[PDB]
Each structure stands twice: as C-alpha cells, then as structure tokens.
Design a protein around this ligand. Structure first.
Ligand code: SF4
Ligand code: SF4
Ligand code: SF4
Ligand code: SF4
Ligand code: SF4
Ligand code: FES
Ligand SMILES: [Ca+2]
Ligand SMILES: [Mg+2]
Ligand SMILES: [Mg+2]
Ligand SMILES: [Mg+2]
Lengths: 378, 196, 154, 144, 238, 127
C-alpha cells in the first residue's frame, strides 16, 4: 500500500498498492467562487451575468436554465422568435463544448490533423457568438422575456456556412474513433459504469446513456419548445470510456439536426415579452412617455419583483441535468439560488469508475466524464 | 402514475401538499417519520435522487415552522425498468438549536456529496454519513457561509481621489423584508405575476 | 500575430467610449444610472450643475467626475443598456494591460469619443513621438458609436 | 561600481537578454484558462495567472511561485485575478497581488487572446526597464 | 373596538380610525399622495379610493379611505378590477402634466410618485402596451428656483398634494407657502421671500416628489448612493 | 405641414427678442428647460434650430414675470405659449401661411411683444 497524491485543477488522493487502484478520494474546492450566495445580492437582471461563468463551456445552458425558471415565477411569455433563437443558441453552445471534449480526445489519440480542425470549428462557432452578442464567452444575451436584442444580418449566412461543412465533418470524427486504430485497446474495457449504478450515483451527462439508460431531459421533461423537434437520443452498450466518447459525438450530430430544423421556422417578429412590468420600455419613446421614463429608471435601478414562492425547472446541458432552484420573497433580488450542477454529482461515480483499474488509464477515465471545475466547484 | 400513489397516501396521513401553479409540488414530512417513509419512497419505485437543497429562512418576511429546512428531489427515470417519470420534492424543517438530520446514504449513492455540501454551507449534520467533511469551503473557514447571518464579506471597490464604493450601502435593489427608500412599498413591489 | 490586425465584429465589447451629440455637447447628464445597473460596482459618477453660459451637456446636470475601474469591469454592456442618453457605449480598443493597479481606472478624458487609443497606447506614444497604431480592424462602426473614428477598411 | 557605467551598461544588456528569453508558465483556473489555450496554440520565468484565485487555492499558487528561478515576472490575466473581479465575496482573493507581486495586469473577462499578447509585449518593455507609469516614473524591471 | 374586514383579513381597531390605516393595519395597501403623518388628512389626490360595503350592500361610489371613519362590521375591497382600474387612472392623471426629468432629478429613487406609478399604474385590462395616452403639450412653467439659501422649488414637478402649505399652517404655524391661481394653472409660491420659518426644511422630507428639495445638498449623489447613518443630533438638549 | 418647421423658426426668434430685452432693460433671462426629446434622442436624428423648450424673463429674486414655451417635436396641437405668471394671462400663438406668427388674428410682432413684457415688468416684478 502506497498512497500517492495527484494534482487538471482537481486534487486526487489515490490509495494504491502496486499498479491497481484501491480507492480514489477527490478533493474539490479549488475553484469555489460562491455563486449561490453572491446571487442573493444581485438583481434578477444582474444574475444573468453569473450563470455563464459556471459552465464556461456550455454556458448558454445555465443562461437558459436560470431564465426559464424566473419566467415561470413571474408569468412571462417568450415570443416565438425568441424560443427559436434560444434553441439555436443553446445547441450551438452545446457543440462548442462537445468539440472541446472531443479535441482533448483527438490529442490522447495522437491525431494532430483532425485536432487542428476541431479547434477551427470551435473558433467559427465562437466567431458566431461575437457576431450577435459581442462576446465569445458569457454573452450577456438571454433575458427574462426573450433576448437582449435581435440578431445581425450576418448571422444567418454565417451559420449556414458552418451548417454545410459540419454534417460530414461530424461523420469523419465518428469514424476516426469508431474504426479505432489504437483507441480500441485504450478504452474498450475501462471505466465500467454499470447501468443500475449510474442511476444511483445520479450520473447524467450522456455518461449515463452511454451506459444504456435512456434518459434525456429534453424528452422526458421537455422545455424550450423541444417538444416539437426531431430527436434521436444516442445510446451506448456497456458504459465505458469508449461508448462515452462516441455518444457525445453521436450527439453533436443530433444537435445539428436541431440547428437546421429550427433555422427553418425562424420567422420575423418580437424578440422579448412586451409586458412593461417585466421588460423595460422601447428606448425610442423614452423621449416622450412619463410612464416610460419612470418604468425605465426604476427597472434598471431597483429590480422587478417576482411573487413569494419556490420553483425548479430541469434542463439538459452537455454535461447532464442542470437547473436552478429559485426562492423568491418578492424582492429586487432572489432569496435563494441553488444551482444543480451536473458536473458536481457526476463526480461521485469517479471513485467507482477507476476502481482497481490501471493508473495511466485514470487520466482518460476522468476525461470521459466531461467535468468542468466551475460547474462542480461553483 | 407512481406519484398518485404517493399523494393518495400523504393526504390520508397528515402530510401537507405544497403546490405552486408552475409545475412543482412538495410534501413536507415531519422530523421522525422522514427516515422511514423516505425509504418507503425508494421501494415504491423511486430510483434517482436528482438534488438536495438547503434553505435558511431566517430573513424571510413571513414566519415558517422552524429556522432551517432541507429539500430532496425524487424521480423515476423514464428509460429504465418500467419507471413512469414521477418526480417531486420532499421537504423537512429543522430546528435551529439542533441541526441534526439522518442521512439517506443507505438508499441513494448520489446523496453522498450532496449531503456534504448542505453541511458545509449550512450547519446541518447528517446522522451516519460516511464522512461529514467540508466539501467546497477552504479547510480553515470558520462557520457556515450559505446561511443568512454569515456575512458575504465584501471589499469596497476603489477609484481615484479616495473615491470609494461600499456595495452594501450602494445596491438600489431591495431584499423583500426590506422596507424601501420611501415610507412603504405596495402593489407590484410586493410581488407581481402575469396571467399568461 | 501582432503584425496582422485582429478583425473584430461590429458588436464587439471593448473599452467604453463616451459619445457627444453633433452640437458638441456631451450626451451624459450625470445620472449615475449606468453605475446603478452594474454588477461589478465599477462606475463612480459625481454630478455637477451645468453653467448656462458655458454648458457641458443639455440638461441642468452633467457629469463632473466619471470613472471606470477596468480591473473590476466585466464588459457586459449592462451599462450601455441602462443609459437613457446613449452616452456610454462599449468600443473597440482591447490592447490595454498596464503596470500599476490604480492606473487602470479610466476617466472622462480617457473615454471621450475624440480620444484614439488606450492609456498605455497613448502614454507610450508620448515619450516616443510615434503616432498610435490600433491593433485591429472592423467592417463598420456601429450606428451607436457615432463619431468614433476607428480603422475599419473592412 | 554598482551604479557605474561599466556595471550599468552591463545589466542593461542582461535585462535586454532575459527580455527575449521569457518562458511563460501559465497557471490557469477557470474560463480564462480556455481563452489562453487559444493563444499558446497559435524551468520557467514569468507565470501567468488566469482566472478566479480561490482562497483555498491561494496558498498553492504561493508555493508554485516561490520555487522558481529568481529573475521572474507574474502576469495577472483578466478581471478575477487582477482584482476580485465581479466576485466580491468571501470565497475569492481580491487581487492576486494579495499573494504574489504582479508585474502586469490585463483587463477583460476573459481578455481576448491577442490582448494577452500585448500583456507580455508590455512585460517586455518592463524587464527592459523601458516602461513608465502614468505618474511619469520609471518602473523597476522586477517585483522584488 | 370596531370589527372591520379589509380584503379577506378581519381586524380589530379603535372607533376613530381611518379606512386607510384600517387597510394598512390589515396588511393590504393602496396609493397615497396628499396624506401624511401628523398632518390633517384630506381627500385631495383621490388615489386611496376603495370600495365599501356596510351590509352585502356595497356603496355606489368609491370612498377616499384617508377621510372615512370605519363603521362596525364594514367591508373594504382594494383588489377588485373596479379599484385597480381607478388606481391606474389616478396614476395616469397625475403623470399627465409631469416634467420627464427622472434621471436628472435629485428626487433619485426616493420618489413616492415614481414608486407608486410602477406599483399601481399601467392597468392590465383583459397587443402592444400603451404607456402614455396623453399626447399634448405638457405644463411648462417656472423651474429650478431657490426659495431660500436652503431650499429649491421646482414648480413643474409639483403634483399638488397639499402637504407643504398644509404643513406650514399646522405644525410650525408659519403660512409662508400657499397655492396661487386656480384650476390647471395653479402653482406653489411665496411672498415671504426669505422663507422665514425656522422649520422650513421639513417640507423637503414631506414633499412626495422633487419640487421642494434640500439645496444644501443639490447634485451630490443619487439616493441609493448614500451611506445612511441613523444617529442623534447633539446641537441642543432635545 | 411645413408650418411645423416654420413654427420653430419663429420660436428661436421669440427667444432672440427675449434675450435682447433682457440685456436692454438689464433683467434676468433664463433657460428654464431643454426639450426632453433631445436629451433622450439617442442616436436618433434631430434638426430643430435649438434645444430650449421653456424660457423665461425673471427678476431680481428670480421670480418669473414672463414665461415662454413651445410644444415638443412629437406632440399634438402645437402652439407657442406666453404666460404672465401671477396675473392669470395665457396666450396662444400659432403660425399662419403668408401671414406670420399670430395670436388668433393679431400679428405677434417684436413691437407688440416688448409692450407685453414692459407692461409685465413694471407691474409684476417683485424686486
Ligand atoms: S461593462 Fe458591465 S461590468 Fe463594466 S461598467 Fe459596464 S455594467 Fe459594469
Ligand atoms: S447612464 Fe448615461 S447619462 Fe447616465 S450617468 Fe451613465 S453615461 Fe451619463
Ligand atoms: S475574469 Fe471572467 S473569464 Fe476570467 S475567470 Fe473570471 S469570470 Fe471567467
Ligand atoms: S419628481 Fe419623481 S417622477 Fe418627477 S422627475 Fe423627479 S423622480 Fe421622476
Ligand atoms: S410642492 Fe411638494 S408638498 Fe408642495 S403641494 Fe407640491 S408636491 Fe405637495
Ligand atoms: S391619500 Fe386619500 S386622497 Fe390623497
Ligand atoms: Ca427662476
Ligand atoms: Mg472497474
Ligand atoms: Mg458548526
Ligand atoms: Mg436657477
């Protein structure tokens, strides 16, 4: 027995005798920022800039989860064009985070040409965000009624470009890992996550369905209008770091089916709810309306006031079940904000995953659970 | 489906069903009957334990049963055995002067880390958890940060000429138990909700 | 690639600029409303009374002191959004790291529209007598940034 | 001869030397770590601090810094390192300078890849002893 | 004691009680301009209207709750569509001839009118929402005028809540401020110039808007930007 | 019509008279308020000859003995307005094509104006 101390930003205490693994006990907290308590001291409008800072990869998911929940509370109705723009944005954030998980996979497998490509794809996706939202990460775009402003004339013709090169591109990656040269021998038997156990440790992020459990929130508790899209939930055989890798890739494919499907119904109209009690008034009349001037001043200073009550709406990110648990006391600022971080609960299945297995494999056995520290730690 | 058999039971035996119009519903079990009846739920077919949230109501405008409370979330994954997809929350209030509450680590494995966090950030003990050790806050943090009476600890933001700002004294935003800048508040400033 | 200018999109979130009207008055009437919406407590506004004979802005109120601590700032534009005049607007300059912390709070004179370049860029081009080169280009300057003279051959 | 043209003109060169011999040891935390792996893709002096420095993680960065060649520089990337950023609370060190001497601060959240380029280009003009503050003074090539 | 039922909540209360303080004692609430603490209550702004039953026999018109004594077994409705519809109309009528200086107004976020407007205004009758129905020239008049070295009057802003004139006669007893012409042309004004009373500053705290404003501190900071420190004055024995 | 434009052309002119009188009788002229439609015009266009909506002739104590306004750009039933404060006298000047700035039917000239303001100064002026 020889207890060694590892340390991405994740300190791992590995009790070990020989070359196996007797138990891993992770110590997290090195990225603890304290979102949950800082948000009790901000506007509901001001909390929107805190959501994208946790999962900085698939950040739009947090933006969405938090918004969807506030909307519920204060009976706000999202226009058709905003529901469409939000799903187009959501999966676009999703492919951006899968591309990152994939890319760090193409590096363990030595393929440097297929990697330098994945890095350019993600850059074209980030390019797209900066087009509409002026930021590459943390785009302060989703709002409680819909979205900040409409999108620029250059967003659609750019999305199409990346909507013509992706379809096949995706398949190339599916092949490189499926028609596995090395990969087969590095993954096929490692990270044994039994179906009955995942559903006990609460693992969720496709690392769940790569284990044979057919549970995706967009289908079982449908939210932002996904109720009306075409959807295959990629499934895996017996949960390993092989099945897990391919699933994510098989997901990227279904995310493009959405992006295209949604792009089809995108129609001109309003982009956020006209209710003066939830939205500031059109700026153009700020030169005329007493009421408008009054509402504006008051909107951006003291916040709006949701009713007393508690609400939890479940969403699905690239990493599993997401969701905000908001408790309101009728203030400018929420009374409690508990964030159900997927990556956090997905980590309890790590001490079981690499149980008694090799040790150089333990790097890739962690990377197959797609954790983001900001998510776990928060 | 599997939740009907839950409500048809709680109704019968003095369990309060809490219901917002939005799509969630609670059931508040007393202290003692929690441990056992909570196991009753697993057998009933509740396999997944999605979350577990700690709530401190100290600074809440209306009074509540006891100072603290923990909420659990139970589910039946719709991609397994027969599982219907029943979901809900179960809450229990917990004395301030006695922060103890039995663990469900017997029943769900996810409840491990989750229970630890509720203990780090609020002072709530869990009778029989593998190891109640701090999860998120640094090792030498004195006390439990997520509760109301523990300061956020803010630094004044600084500018030139000794012009500084204290975020606490600055926020135009109100705290619900907060009276406001004028005499009183009323109407939409005590809560607003549209009628879809 | 500090030899080939970075092409940024028109919506990009850069160093705040404070715009003027055609007339030449500033748009800012010292209302401290931007400062209000700001999540970071990064804006400080001291107001002053306009002199009717020699006016700063069109109200009875102008901004005596205007200051943004960029080391606190997050660049969310929440501020540009709160503003009733269209005064504060995120710009394009990004080249702006520096040495002393308190040198990173910009001032009115640091963010007016007429000013080309960031503190560092203009300070180095001082003890140097070599005109400022901005390390970027854009397709067009937003409708909102009226006046802002920027390198945008597109 | 500490301040005589001989020794003087000498260290002027040595400095100009380790000026172009800067070997960056990135110390990424959250979101900023991801923006920099977009600038490095296209035995160390000079460490770059990118992100929210946690109070639990604070003592760690200290060791990493200490055990380091002696001529060294710290760059403070983004808003969370440069000050508490938008996280003005218990959990987070309000300015990495609170723990390690910073030589250059770089604003943004996260600052654009090419910003971090200017950040080091500046750290250059600084170890050359050719950089001044807004007060018109000459800056010491190294924090110590 | 008289047994009054405000909305659904029943409340005990002494005989000499206003229906207003009746409704505020209950928990519920209502608009509120002209009426003030320690000042004679009148029904001038006409915003605190409520519906009243004295059975279930409801009275035909709305009652100003600030100048109506509670009868025993009375019923007060403050929620009905009838009430709200009125409330939002009283907001509307007030803002009718109001100035539009909010951002540039020392009455920061501490402004009863601002607040109430967003509390009760913009009725939700059950398409784009109409912010302002009035579309004519507003009431332009005397603006930003110092009454004393300590006080500055903004006539445009005044909503005619009778507070200041009312206060001067009643509390100190120095009639140094009063209304002028009648109708829509009426304004606040003085002929005692100095603003002679040694208790003139108190109008500054009563005024619901930013007409009467403490000039010692014009344009220093916005109301939320102050660091309030509750203490005591040690200038004299009181 | 284009009468809307020509109205403001006269509104500036009235202001000019006011400033003339003010320096010529040595009495306070005061800008009382700028058009809100100008302070809040963001990037929007603006082409009115000035920015002053409420102008006055005040006295030694600063109390107005003459007031003047003109309806904002985006407002209905536009007229310019002369009001002698404490003496209940309001006036409504419009603009006729080929005639001029008229008060119902009488030409509101620089001559007729000065009469009103002098009359008002002697009488209403407190100090
Ligand atoms: S960009 Fe955001 S963080 Fe910066 S001053 Fe504006 S509101 Fe504050
Ligand atoms: S919100 Fe606009 S006008 Fe108001 S103080 Fe800020 S920049 Fe000046
Ligand atoms: S400064 Fe911004 S991008 Fe960098 S770590 Fe902080 S929140 Fe993330
Ligand atoms: S008095 Fe109130 S409503 Fe009128 S401008 Fe001032 S703050 Fe706004
Ligand atoms: S000046 Fe103030 S207190 Fe006096 S009547 Fe008018 S609004 Fe009321
Ligand atoms: S408060 Fe009762 S009428 Fe004004
Ligand atoms: Ca005057
Ligand atoms: Mg195993
Ligand atoms: Mg304790
Ligand atoms: Mg004056």
């Amino acid at each position: 027995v020889m207890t060694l101390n590892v340390g991405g930003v994740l300190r791992l205490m590995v009790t070990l005798s020989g070359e196996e693994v007797l138990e891993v006990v992770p110590h997290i907290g090195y990225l603890h920022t304290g979102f949950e308590k800082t948000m009790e001291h901000r506007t509901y409008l001001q909390n929107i800039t805190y959501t994208p800072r946790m999962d900085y990869l698939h950040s739009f998911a947090h933006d969405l989860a938090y918004a969807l929940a506030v909307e519920k509370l204060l009976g706000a109705v999202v226009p058709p064009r905003a529901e469409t723009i939000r799903v187009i944005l959501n999966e676009l954030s999703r492919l951006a985070s899968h591309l990152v998980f994939l890319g760090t996979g193409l590096l363990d497998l030595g393929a440097l040409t297929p990697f330098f490509y994945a890095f350019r794809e993600r850059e074209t996706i980030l390019d797209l965000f900066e087009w509409v939202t002026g930021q590459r990460f943390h785009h302060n775009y989703i709002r409680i009624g819909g979205v900040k402003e409409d999108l620029p004339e250059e967003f659609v013709p750019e999305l199409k470009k990346l909507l013509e090169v992706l379809p096949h591109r995706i398949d190339e990656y599916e092949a490189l890992f499926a028609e596995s040269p090395i990969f087969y021998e590095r993954a096929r038997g490692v990270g044994v996550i039994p179906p009955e156990v995942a559903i006990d440790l609460g693992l969720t992020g496709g690392s769940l369905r790569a284990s044979g459990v057919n549970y995706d929130v967009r289908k079982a508790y449908p939210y932002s209008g996904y109720e009306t899209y075409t959807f295959d939930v990629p499934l895996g055989e017996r949960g390993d770091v092989f099945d897990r890798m391919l699933v994510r890739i098989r997901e990227m494919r279904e995310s493009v089916k959405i992006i295209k499907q949604a792009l089809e119904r995108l129609e001109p109209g309003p982009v956020r709810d006209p209710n003066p009690q939830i939205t500031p008034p059109p700026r153009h009349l700020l030169e005329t309306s007493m009421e408008a001037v009054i509402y504006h001043f008051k909107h951006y200073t003291e916040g709006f006031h949701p009713p007393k009550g508690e609400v939890y709406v479940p969403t699905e990110s690239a990493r599993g079940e997401l969701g905000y648990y908001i408790v309101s006391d009728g203030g400018s600022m929420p009374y409690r904000v508990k964030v159900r971080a997927p990556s956090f609960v997905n980590l309890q299945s790590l001490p079981y995953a690499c149980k008694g297995e090799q040790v150089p494999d333990m790097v890739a056995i962690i990377a197959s659970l797609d954790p983001v520290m900001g998510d776990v730690d928060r | 489906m599997r939740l009907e058999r839950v409500l048809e039971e709680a109704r019968a035996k003095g369990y309060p069903i809490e219901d917002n119009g939005l799509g969630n519903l609670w059931v508040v079990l007393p202290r003692e009957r929690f441990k056992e009846e909570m196991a009753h739920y697993k057998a009933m077919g509740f396999n997944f334990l999605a979350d577990i949230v700690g709530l401190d109501y100290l600074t809440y405008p209306d009074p509540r049963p006891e100072r603290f409370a923990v909420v659990y979330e139970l589910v039946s994954l719709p991609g397994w055995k027969d599982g219907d997809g029943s979901r809900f929350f179960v809450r229990v209030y917990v004395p301030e002067e006695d922060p103890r509450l039995p663990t469900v680590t017997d029943l769900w494995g996810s409840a491990n880390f989750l229970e630890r966090e509720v203990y780090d950030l609020f002072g709530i003990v869990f009778e029989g958890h593998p190891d109640l050790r701090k999860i998120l806050t640094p090792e030498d943090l004195e006390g439990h940060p997520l509760r109301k009476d523990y300061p956020l600890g803010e630094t004044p933001t600084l500018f030139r000429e000794g012009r500084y700002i204290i975020p606490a004294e600055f926020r135009a935003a109100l705290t619900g138990k907060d009276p406001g800048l004028t005499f009183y508040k009323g109407g939409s400033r005590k809560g607003y909700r549209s009628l879809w | 690639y500090p030899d080939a200018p970075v092409a940024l999109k028109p919506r990009f979130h850069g160093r705040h600029v404070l715009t003027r009207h055609p007339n030449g008055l500033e748009k800012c009437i010292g209302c401290s409303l931007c400062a209000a919406a700001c999540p970071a407590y990064a804006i400080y506004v001291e107001p002053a009374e306009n002199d009717p004979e020699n006016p700063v802005s069109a109200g009875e109120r102008y901004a005596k002191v205007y200051e943004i601590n960029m080391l606190r700032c997050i660049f969310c534009g929440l501020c540009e959004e709160a503003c009733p005049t269209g005064a504060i607007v995120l710009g394009y300059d990004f080249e702006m790291a520096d040495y002393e912390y308190s040198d990173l709070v910009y001032g009115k004179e640091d963010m007016l529209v007429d000013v080309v370049g960031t503190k560092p860029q203009r300070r180095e081009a001082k003890r140097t007598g070599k005109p400022v080169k901005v390390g970027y280009v854009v397709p067009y300057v937003r409708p909102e940034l009226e006046g802002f003279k920027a390198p945008t051959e597109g | 001869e500490r301040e005589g043209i001989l020794f003087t003109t000498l260290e002027k060169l040595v400095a100009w030397g380790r000026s172009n011999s800067l070997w960056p040891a990135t110390f990424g935390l959250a979101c900023c770590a991801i923006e920099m792996m977009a600038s490095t893709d296209a035995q160390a002096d000079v460490m770059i601090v990118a992100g929210r420095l946690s109070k639990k993680m604070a003592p760690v960065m200290r060791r990493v810094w200490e055990q380091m060649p002696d001529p060294k520089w710290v760059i403070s990337m983004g808003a969370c390192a440069s000050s508490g950023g938008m996280f003005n609370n218990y959990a987070i060190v309000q300015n990495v300078d609170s723990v390690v001497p910073v030589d250059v601060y770089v604003p943004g959240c996260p600052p654009r890849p090419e910003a971090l380029i200017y950040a080091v280009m500046q750290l250059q003009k600084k170890v050359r002893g050719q950089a001044y503050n807004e007060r018109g003074e000459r800056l010491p090539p190294v924090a110590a | 004691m008289v047994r009054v039922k405000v909305n659904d909540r029943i409340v005990e209360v002494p005989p000499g009680t206003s229906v207003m303080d009746a409704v505020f004692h209950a928990g519920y609430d209502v608009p509120l301009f002209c009426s003030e603490k320690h000042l004679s209550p009148i029904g001038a702004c006409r915003m605190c209207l409520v519906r009243i039953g004295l059975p279930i026999q409801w009275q035909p018109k709305l009652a100003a709750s600030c100048v109506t004594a509670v009868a025993d077994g009375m019923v007060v409705d403050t929620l009905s569509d009838v009430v709200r519809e009125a409330q939002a109309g009283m907001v509307e009528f007030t803002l009718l001839n109001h100035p539009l200086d909010c951002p540039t107004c020392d009455k920061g976020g501490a402004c009863e009118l601002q607040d109430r407007t967003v509390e009760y205004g913009l009725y939700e009758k059950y398409e784009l929402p109409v912010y302002t129905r009035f579309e004519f020239t507003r009431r332009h008049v005397d603006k930003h005028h110092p009454l004393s070295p300590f006080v500055i009057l903004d006539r445009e802003r005044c909503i005619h809540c009778k507070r200041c004139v009312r206060y001067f006669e009643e509390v100190p007893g120095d009639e140094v401020l009063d209304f002028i012409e009648r109708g829509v042309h009426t304004f606040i004004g003085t002929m005692d110039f100095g603003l002679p009373s040694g208790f003139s500053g108190n109008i500054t705290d009563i005024c619901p808007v930013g007409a009467l404003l403490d000039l010692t501190a014009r344009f220093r900071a916005r109301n939320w930007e102050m660091e309030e420190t509750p203490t005591t004055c040690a200038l004299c024995p009181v | 019509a284009s009468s809307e434009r020509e109205l403001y052309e006269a509104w500036v002119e009235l202001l000019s008279w006011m400033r003339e009188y003010a320096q010529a009788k040595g009495v306070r002229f005061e800008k009382e308020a700028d058009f809100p439609d100008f302070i809040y015009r963001m990037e929007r266009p603006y082409d009115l000859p000035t920015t002053i909506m409420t102008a006055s002739l005040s006295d030694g104590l600063g109390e107005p003995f003459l007031l003047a306004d003109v309806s904002p750009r985006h407002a209905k039933l536009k007229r310019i307005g002369l009001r002698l404060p404490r003496a209940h006298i309001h006036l409504h000047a419009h603009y006729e094509p080929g005639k001029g700035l008229v008060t119902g039917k009488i030409p509101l000239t620089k001559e007729r104006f000065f009469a009103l303001a002098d009359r008002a100064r002697e009488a209403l002026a407190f100090a």
